[model samples]
Target chain A: TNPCEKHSCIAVIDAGSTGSRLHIYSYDTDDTNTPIHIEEIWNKKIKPGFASIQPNSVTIDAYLTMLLADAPIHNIPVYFYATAGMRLLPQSQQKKYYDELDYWFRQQSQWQLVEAKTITGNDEALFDWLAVNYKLDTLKSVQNKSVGVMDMGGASVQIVFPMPKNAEISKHNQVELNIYGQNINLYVHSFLGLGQTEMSHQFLNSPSCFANDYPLPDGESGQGNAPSCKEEVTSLMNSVHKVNQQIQPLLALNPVNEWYSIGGISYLASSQLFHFENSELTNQSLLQQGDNQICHQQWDILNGQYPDDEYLYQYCLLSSYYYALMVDGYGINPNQTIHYIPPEQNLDWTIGVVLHRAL
Target chain B: TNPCEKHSCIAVIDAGSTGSRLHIYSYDTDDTNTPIHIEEIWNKKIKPGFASIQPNSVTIDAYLTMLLADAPIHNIPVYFYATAGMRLLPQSQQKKYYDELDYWFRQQSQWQLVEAKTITGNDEALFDWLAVNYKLDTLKSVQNKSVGVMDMGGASVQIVFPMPKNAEISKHNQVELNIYGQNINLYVHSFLGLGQTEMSHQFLNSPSCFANDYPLPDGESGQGNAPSCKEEVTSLMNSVHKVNQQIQPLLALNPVNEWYSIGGISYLASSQLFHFENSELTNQSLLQQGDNQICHQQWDILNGQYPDDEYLYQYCLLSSYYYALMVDGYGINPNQTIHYIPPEQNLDWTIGVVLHRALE
Candidate 1:
């Protein structure tokens, strides 16, 4: 609306394990003004998203090819990223998959599988903290919010505590040191050592770490909780309680007004088959009885044409690139996706170096 | 208090990175009890009462020695269990350690490492569920009155929304099948990739992700709460929020009157130093200051005694024989620790194990 605003936009692509998304935002290239208007041009999940707990690389290649189908080659420069399942593959396997994916992408168009890296333990932590921050902003009405961020990807559930600023502060740093965008300084701690998939093993294996003391031991032959009056099942819950104790304090430390939950688990929560609901809908849903308060996409408001996943992925990609651009500006990297894309995955991704100009 | 009501108790020898303890309980095993009282106990640390974390055979030896120091060597069955740090090591390493440990025991001394293969995951699930159920018995005053179970160890945190049922039920069978616990239950969903050490790396390495996105990008900077921040950080938070959506609902599934959190993390929370507490003081401490809440013994009351590699080794020799005698109910496999002498480092631990048993 204002011609005086020197505006540019950065996109972040959250190439999720189950789906992909693109998000867009327009902001001042310099400090003159903050991002003019944040928009989600599109938010649509790619088709054929059922790539098992550990899907093969070809499956992922097919995913990306099928996803970018309708978009114009508008070369505005897209920032794409991926996590979990795709990242867990060994380097050799990753390369094998990426090489095949890049070549396949080349056949579809000149686009390359430019850069990729699995969400590391650290990335999981940082993103978890970041997610907690998002909850405060997305669901502000919920006060003293301290939401538990549980990300159930193909292979893990990253639980985290996004420590909001507990104490009062006089002035906030206009922009985060890393991202050129203005952000309040915040603290957080998160982890995903044995998430859902891993927990499945825990449930299946009944690891000894799970112990019991005060629960009628299994096979007493009574019931409110156990058929044979077993405490075995109760043990799992106790173990969970144990871990909850660890994470809650991390969250308790920050003492927020509310708890906002989000992640791939959300999609499962929204599934009609799981019969996900709205009222009691917070963490990952299954279209259940209490699913009233689910967060729906405001795609048009965000200014994106695609659905949630892709739209979210694109602008989200800008984060990695913004940092890259900063480093690039310093001559460390000039117009390159800062993340390492193996030689094989380079065809589709490395080509994005050309698009870095658009970023 | 009822002379006729016989008390049933459990013996748990929890091996943690920090230390080990043998606790014999007396009372109803049902979580309804406030806290099962310790009828008999035994404990030994790296030294007299402190020390022990990462250790070699020496630590095990010292631990064993301490455990046997108290129990009558002629008779006693000991349960051996471990978590985190110890298991991470190679099998041969653990075996050699165990072999020597068993060698130190006598005719009745028996030591057995807790194995997951023995008890199915059902037990694991149930233990956690029951813990949460019992915890709600206290947290009825907190919001929702629902208990949240979290198992935090030296390396991981397992969050759970355990199965909580009503106290009295008309039909015992119905309670066991539906309300009490399900034969086949799909309760837990996990996050395997995150951890404390790893989390620190996340924020420290990528400060951008740790940004506090208060208000939209257009909002004021840190005026009220934190304000004015990067849209990307917000976007990143969105990514994280997506994950939270998965677990939150489950935690609320069994809507109780309050919420109770457990685990080593809880120790970090309520414990003033080593004892558990009721206040959320630690939570506030970490939030405002960003320092960890873990205190010395508060970390986890593992074996009740701090670990010591040296003492365990010696104790292993004596306790093994002692446990073999205790386990006369169950025949011993000769290779048992009838006699054992550990290296110098393991000297102290030998005292730890028996000490743990005697104290319990």
Candidate 2:
């Protein structure tokens, strides 16, 4: 029999801006060959739209019960972390929900509750950084290489990497963590309100990427000129740079090198961009060619009908800014140079937070 | 002007198995942007066989003197490392020559001699590994992917990659060092007597890869059957594997993933195999086909009365085993996966060792 027969399960709740999800993972706690042999056994997600009205506590307990029904919970541990969705709420409103859940978890003994908090945007970025390396099994690899992580969400954009030794260390996105007996000096920064969805509104008055009749929040319209859209998005990305001065030094210190042994991870572009059903990898120039092709002509000019192609509409805005944010803002090479982590393998920060707390 | 005004020069004497060479380099020492900005300024090489009578020390000194004539002599740091040539020599004999050179360098005060010694085979491998990463500048980059280094020399082979953390750490070919404030743990190992030249001796009994009239030490020859030559070389490669237990665990732990981002370096095969001068990258299958085309037929069979087909004879043996050792022994995919460091760039370990010492 294997020595690591005994297993310990851990659960993480990811409260993202778009939705709330729960993941229950099982691990052979006694396994020493790897840090731990871990696997995600259960996953549950819910997007609460206008049609939903239920107490936060009731909804969470039912979801947890249903998700964890198949697993052993007598000796497991659970971690809870909320991201941008709760960040937009008033402090009292956030506290009312968290305090109710915290107090209930404080009284329970079925599964050990480690900690629950509304982590900052920086913490969210750091957790994802940990998740990327950990999932890739690069976290404790003998190599001196450390993979860089970048995640662009609905409300913010975040980037993280190891800080060079000679940089002028002020408060420029530097983080210190003692991980697996290795003292890691990390550079982490998250720019709020600079996400694709947020920046799309910055140029809503004369949107470069969108069509003239594209839908808007307050029943508004845009000019949808392709060149003007690129300029406006470029300006918005530059403005975000003003507040994230912390990242500049690290970029400057980024070695004038050829390429990575394993390229760094850029989240959205690597996974989604082209089309949903059949996902394919394409470089910056080719993707931009498609974006430009769509922007230069009206929807009906190329296609037979005008109203909503569904394909062209998404590319006009989301594709425009997503590409701008990654290649233009972060300076990533489009081809084979940057890596994309798939969503199902746990790109969310919650899994990392659980692992970090467990370790 | 840029603030990196202070410059320091260093030299490396690579006493390799096949030849000896010298390289002179200059770097900006005061550069804060990077630890050091360096470039190769001068290089020299010579080999005239037993038609030589000068002392080893004298020949080296003359090469150095002629090579460094244009550079600043004051406060320069010179590093000397001898690889495989001295590696096979008796300890006392190797020390006798080093002691003389060491005494001469110590007596002189014009330049700072950091250290001089005949480095171990492992150190030679480590140095080349460092050179590969340093040239690529993968050392201090923001990415968490460390490139692996592989070098196949005439008399031996060397390979180094990061050790997997889970593997048992008992003499598993591990080396530890700190460079530019980054603590590094490297897995480095070198096999002796496994080189192309040495394996050529294993089958000198039957002489598989040569014709019945091919030139031999005693003016004798062989049947030169290509299949028998391949089997003999393959057997010799397997014999070398018996002693080098260091590589087994790494081969086991090598990730079953896509090809290496920047595949490790292989000396001659990865660079150029045939007499094709231009030397573009091609896969193992195509290379093997080219080898077979030349091997299946006798040298004279292709061209009538082939007097001195110096071309096809070179590949008869070297090409056979080079493919076997890499593909079978180490499991490297020769297709578009592995990479070769360009010949123009310095692939020697001396540059890496000198850089490592400077950083530490």
Candidate 3:
């Protein structure tokens, strides 16, 4: 286990735009389990997806140089998680990234080298569902009558649940193999692009927010950003509110109790949402801090690196990074990721996908 | 100052321990005293330093990946500031770094391609001591007194000043610099190999929490990892105490009222070092909270993006990111940027560096 008498694995670099980080998890290589002693290595802010679309070579080079400058002698394996900036690119772009990536490793390191892949929407939705799935499987010490899960990302909101009474959702991939670290039936579904950014745009605009959640009359493009006087963010949130209004009918049938949220939403939803008085929905504060330190820390430290508070202060926005991770790091079925219920084809679709995994 | 709208000139790349950053400073291309504007950018964290002495292929690949992945539409000229990792290797290891570097980057993209020509420290150090050559054009307010500067980096700490009045460093390049941003004075210096984790360990073992600023006597290497170590952060404060003890003599001689600190030290140095009790060191607390209504509403609702408190919560710990930027992003001289000694550079026999820029 003593890879070297003097050296140790230094850090894990989670690359991102807006900011990036280094989690220095050192292993003595002699200790039991090769236990990792994680430390804050160093982190900085460089737009890997600045003005252009391709990765920022100069910015990345600068980060490398700084790392060498800081710890010039330690021999360690620096695994890279390129995030959305690189992995989110199309197949052609992905190929371009890897081809050059293989060569870069050939020349630079002495330790084990590997680029991290991303988790796709299906995989992520499944992960979220399984997280709840495990809960339902061992339906002991149960907190609520049923289970609920929410993952509000930068661009969309994904949810997983155990079919409540009358909860109308067609089972998509019912066969499971030990999800949520345990076997549980989970109804996983993505509220197509109902992320914080998208939802905010929808809530402040779409009539569906006021409508009876009857899957909005769809005619326009899904993307809210229009060249005209389109308040993309506001419009997006309104649309989501509308979708929620329509979905409220399901809640009547499958009445549930508990709710668990993950992903970027946990951070933002962790706070008080009710601002004004006379708001009927002020009972549950909806906002609660995430239970995971790793995910929260990534946002905390990396965001701090940006210049102005206005930039570093942003959270739960349309995170190109998360989407990038979903598509690249963890591979899953894209169709399962998004279920767009058009007013025409699936108009009265009452569309809902349930995730079921076998024990 | 829009390049597409007008014309763009210089771009800076800050290679930090965490990641690489790009900043485009708008210049007249003719006017020597033009302003700098940060354009679109990329930041990927494929830290290529821990493994090699020179920049390895991961280093090269990270850069290419960021540019291609983020700003595939635009191509801009950029200058690079490579930090500690670049200087780690010996000549042989360095050769391996450059040989691989010279291979690719031939393909055309949105921006004009440029490889890292030199490290940030070598180039910035040249400008760091510019107070000697150029008039302290910005130091009009401190006409009678000289200002001190200290910058704390992740791996190293730099404290710069005019040679101490009593222990005057010579104006020869050996220690301090002459007019031309040259080195000529002999100053104190310190480089601690200990990280926060290591520092935490040292605090557990040491009788006094002082490590960074105080000189570790013989047999000090084994003074870490104690069983009675429950409240471990105190030793870090002791490190600050050590910094103050070393810097006392210089402060009395110089008579500095206004002090500044840059890098992680500036924030962490609170409670014990940043201020005397009942005094305001900064306008906002180290851990920042939201000010605007929308920020409080949708969290970052001013932009109507993120949800509640989440946007504001992330703001509290952003100093680390800023600390990373000091070396990686702007390559701003830290020693000059801060007034007090940084915790990262706490060491004995180590003098600091300073730039007496004329400031109103």
Candidate 4:
């Protein structure tokens, strides 16, 4: 049987700081209630933030409508959400762009316009927490410990966790949700300007921000000091204390967020973590030094064997900032063991949005 | 444990009419009796026929051995066989080449020399037959209607089938074998100069040999006549009856050689069948028209969209010659139903050879 012929599709458009990305997922009709046999038929990203796109939002709306042209015969519930990138734009312009985009998309009868919103940092953290725990299926189990979530995006970073039952709800950070037949209280904090991309931009003037053999903005080549770089990154991570105080009891439970905590206080980590931590120091210091080395070897290979790959020029800076974020900002122990959920198994707020719309 | 890290590898070097091909299959340590967990790590072909390569047999032997460099473990059993192209070489040179190759490969302790031979046409037909039926597991079962095989290769074409109980075994075409604890009798025939490639060479000067707008070998342009081509192809198929007369009782069943009673005569066809019939006339008339249009659309796409592909220049002649072979030679009916084993599941004689060694 043709797999796509029988399956239904849903398109989720994420207009984040770095770029506008779309993911169209196909779910078999017979397995809707289960894992949905989700196949990501289309996952592509294009440049220019949704709010920053000049002139009008009509071009993007038409482009997004065109993306659904290949979707199977089903009501493709179209969703648009702005991340830290959109939030950085002038409030008036952001609102105007979103209003026009929303009106234009709602007019297209081809798809279901579920809703569009510039999601808040707290809610962003909550959705990620929900997405990870939801993937672990721990939300459905009363016996399992609720997991923690760490999401380090391009323009901002978010740390989310389930608070202890008796702990006082940290009024500002607390996000309460009734999902999957369970009532839960979560501590979610979004640290603006602390994302790897934003932090790299802020630290670009520092000689330590560039990797060895990588040229600087001034055209001078330089290398970084891992220790001093971590110190600067720690200063950027000043908000971790504020986030930890409210969920102190839960934070103490997983002394080191590793495999032991997997049974004790399992943390559902995000793929963005690797994007930030693909550095030598980060590789050396992490508990589970995942595929960081594999990522490094791949870049040098590009610079040597595939000189045509322009992306390698940016890896050195991005990786440097990533190392700082993990070592200085989060103070992640090198000895602490950790694991990553492969892309096929990983989830994002979009997945939570889908489930919320369905269930 | 990593599958490749544990299993041993065997290299099968096919020096056929077209090119020298190597297939490196790794079998798991445990699964020997069941369908072997054969992983083809290296399925690569290099320029010119093995017979076409002159001088150093050692360089080619080392090259064959070197193909196994990426393989996990040691002692790879290597088997080399030459098909029609090598079969046409001078007898003394072919023997000397085989001897030198055998001695050189055996001297190198890195791999087990499983021995090399220039295979006969009957054995060629037999292996093609065994590879497919055994893949379908028909050989071990009485319930299955033993299938027929048609392999139209580069230099020769082979046809194989199961014989009737009362049929007198034709001394020449009969091939008997015991495999998988089952005794079997088969009717096998291999016709040289009939392969799609060889026939295309012989018919190159014919106006009916070129596709629409394809250039002639002399740098002049030409087009082929589908009807005229078929008539010429039928003239070339006159030898079909000569081959059939020796094994008359089994042959009379399929007088036109279409299909008839052999309990349930099943035909396992090859992908080469579609290379000839890219036109509407060819697609509609063939017994099985597998991917004929798809091949044309692909070539037109290459010519229009992707000029980097140099292979389309050859397709016109190939498709033309292929058309004649089916219509004139096989006289295949357009409406007749015949199916091909999907590429993912198709097999060649090398598979039978590998299995034969394992079972023996």
Say which candidate scores most in TM-score: 2
Candidate 1, residues A173-215, lDDT tens digits: the string is: 1112123233333432222323333222222111111112111
lDDT of 1 by residue, B1-360 (tens): 421136543334545434554544343333432333223433333322112221234444545666655632212344555443333332333455456545544323344332211111223223444444433333212233334443333322334443444344212111121222223122432222122222221112121222222111112211111111122222212232222444444344543233333333333332232232333322222222211111111212322343432121111111121122111211222232211111111221112222122210
Residues A199-256, model 3: lDDT tens digits:
3322221221211121111111112111111222322223212334434444455544
Over the full model, what C-alpha lDDT does candidate 1 score relative to the true structure?
0.31
Identify the candidate with maximal lDDT.
2
Q: Each model's TM-score, in the order given? A: 0.32, 0.42, 0.31, 0.41
Two-chain DockQ for each candidate model: 0.02, 0.00, 0.01, 0.00
Off by over 4 Å in 2: A1-359, B1-5, B29-34, B48-75, B103-112, B142-146, B165-172, B211-213, B218-227, B243-245, B256-283, B286-290, B293-313, B334-336, B358-360
Model 4 in CAPRI terms: which quality? incorrect
Better of 2 and 3 by DockQ: 3
The interface root-mean-square deviations, each candidate in sequence, come to 16.0, 36.8, 26.8, 36.8
lDDT of 2 by residue, A137-203 (tens): 7656444765677676655667777775445675535777655556676777766556554354334
Encode model 4's per-residue lDDT on B32-87: one tens digit a residue: 25335656766766545665443255445645555545545446777887877665
Cα RMSD over interface residues, candidate 3: 26.8
